[PDB]
Each structure stands twice: as C-alpha cells, then as structure tokens.
Amino acid sequence: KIQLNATSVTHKPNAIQMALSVCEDLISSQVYAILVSHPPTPNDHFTPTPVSYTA
Amino acid sequence: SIGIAVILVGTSDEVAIKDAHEKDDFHHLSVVPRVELVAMNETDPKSIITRICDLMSDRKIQGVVLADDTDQEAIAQILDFISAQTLTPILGIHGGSSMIMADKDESSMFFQFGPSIEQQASVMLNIMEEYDWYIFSIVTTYFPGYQDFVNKI
Amino acid sequence: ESAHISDAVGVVAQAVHELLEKENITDPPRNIWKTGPLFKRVLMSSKYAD
Ligand SMILES: *[C@@H]1O[C@H](CO)[C@@H](O)[C@H](O)[C@H]1NC(C)=O
C-alpha cells in the first residue's frame, strides 16, 4: 500500500525565485528526495546550491 | 540613512535593546542609520528567507543582524548562503549565530563575534603553561575544524 | 539523461522500500528531521548490482 506521488517544476531565469518556489513547494508536498538534471544551462555557474542548502 | 535590520528569535529584552540602540556617538559622521527590530521564531530556514526577503524589499536593508538562543550551527551555515547571494552583509552576535563554521564564501559578507580555533588553542596552552602540567593527549572527531586545531597545537 | 534518470529513480525506489522496512518513519513538516541523519546514512549504505 505504499504510493509514489510525483511533483515536477520547470526552469526560471533567476536563482532566488526558483530557490524559494522549489523549497516551499517541495516542503508543502513533504517530499523525500530532490533531483537536478539540466546540463544545457545558459548560465555557466551550474548552481544547484540554493536547492542543496535549503533541503 | 542606511537601513539596518535587527532580528530576534527567542526570549530577550527587546525593550532594553531598543532603548540602548541609540547609545552610540555617530554624530561626527553623516550616517543617520535606520534600524528596524523584528521578532521571529525558529520554525524553519524558509521562514527566515521569507522574512529577510520582505525586510530587504520593504526597508531596503543593507545589513542584517541575527541573534538567537539555539545550539545549532546550521543557522550561520545557511546564513552564509544568503550573505554570499545578497550584496547586503550579515552579522551574527549571539546564540546560534555565533559558532564559527569551517569557512565563509569568497563572495560572503558574514562575520561573527568570537575567537578562532587557533586562538583557543593558544589560550588552552597558556593555561597548561600557568599550572605546570606538560603531559597531555588529544582526541577529536570528524568535525571539519579538527585538522586546523591539530596542526595549530 | 534518459538512462541516467532511470537508474537514479530505480535506486531511489529500492532505497525507499528498504527504508520502509524500518521503524520510526517520521515525515518532514510544512525543528530538524530527527531521522535526517538516519535517512542519509541509510542512503549511504545503498549498495546495488543492477
Ligand atoms: C501529490 O502532490 C500534489 C502536489 O503537491 C498534491 O496536490 C496532491 O494532493 C498529492 N497527492 C497525493 C496522492 O499525495
């Protein structure tokens, strides 16, 4: 009787709004794991850091 | 007319601090800083993010001071990210915002009130010099600041 | 990214089912997660062969 509920979000050009939105949404959904899987970032920084620190 | 943010979480004499807020002699330089004091809780980091977002959006905060009463190093650990990602510097003076983590970011602007590991090692060796005890041993766990202490001693 | 995410999701599913066999299964609220380090260490011991 275990169930797997899925939640996905897309990109936004900013890194604070994306951070806060993802944090609040995946906190409210009470998720267990978070993934980052985008190579072709126009930003050369390659920063998933806000997601990592917030989670 | 700089904007200074004061955030207090936990029990504290807010009225005494507010009365003693204007206890400095800053009349010799045209600064007239603006200080806003706000109380907060220790619910979650995202609440702190929302509070600082609102404060900097409203009052144009150019400086954040955090004081708390917890015993968790995560406060400054996450505050480092905000300090690095925001041009406004942040300061920690008491509570959970006082313990020094490993290191700050290159773009970080967050500072703390306290001594370094090496200064504490020097004081502890001064104590061992004061009372003649010259035989000792050192044991530690895998907290990041262990190599610094061992090499300093 | 296809097979990469496929393998990652398979690993996540096996780890979640492995953790479901244990006790004291709390959940993150909307304080720290008291099984935070516990879950992290469970994921650290994640060995697989497929
Ligand atoms: C799945 O997540 C969505 C979005 O957070 C939520 O609206 C929904 O109630 C969840 N459903 C289940 C079965 O948990």
Q: How far is CA C18 from CA A1, A52, B146, C24, C42, in A?
A: 15, 24, 34, 14, 9
Q: Helix %, strand %, coil % for chain A, to 5?
A: 35, 0, 65
- On whether the CB atoms of residues B125 and B98 are closer than 8 A, the answer is no
Segment (H or E) for B124: helix B117-130
- On whether the CB atoms of residues B8 and B37 are closer than 8 A, the answer is yes
Return binding residues of B: 94
CA distance A47 to A44: 9
* Pocket of ligand 1, beta carbon within 6 A: A 5, 7, 29
- On whether the CB atoms of residues A30 and C28 are closer than 8 A, the answer is yes
**What DSSP designation does B73 have?**
T
Over its C-alpha atoms, chain B yields an Rg (Å, rounded) of 19
Over its C-alpha atoms, chain A yields an Rg (Å, rounded) of 12
Strand order in the sheet with B64-67: B34-40, B3-9, B64-67, B90-94, B110-112
Buried b vs exposed e over C18-29: b needs ≥16 C-beta within 10 Å? ebeeeeeeeebe
- On whether the CB atoms of residues B151 and B121 are closer than 8 A, the answer is no
Determine the residue among B9, B41, B44 to mutate to test chain C binding: the one whose Cβ has the most chain C Cβ atoms within 10 Å.
B44
Is the CB of C32 inside 8 Å of chain B's CB atoms? yes
Q: How many CB pairs under 8 A join B and C?
A: 4
Q: By what technique were these coordinates determined?
A: cryo-EM
DSSP string across A31-43: -S---------SS
Judged by CB atoms closer than 8 Å, whether chains meet at A30 and C29 is answered as yes
Nearby residues of B99 by Cβ (< 8 Å), 6 or more positions away = B73, B76, B112, B114
Task: Give, for ligand 1, the residue of A29, A30, A31, A32 to mutate: max count of ligand atoms closer than 8 Å to Cβ.
Answer: A29
User: What's the resolution in A?
Assistant: 5.4
Q: How far is CA B121 from CA A37, A41, B76, B128, B145, in A?
A: 44, 46, 22, 11, 12
Name all chains with 3 or more CB-CB pairs below 8 Å to chain A: B, C
**What DSSP designation does B87 have?**
S
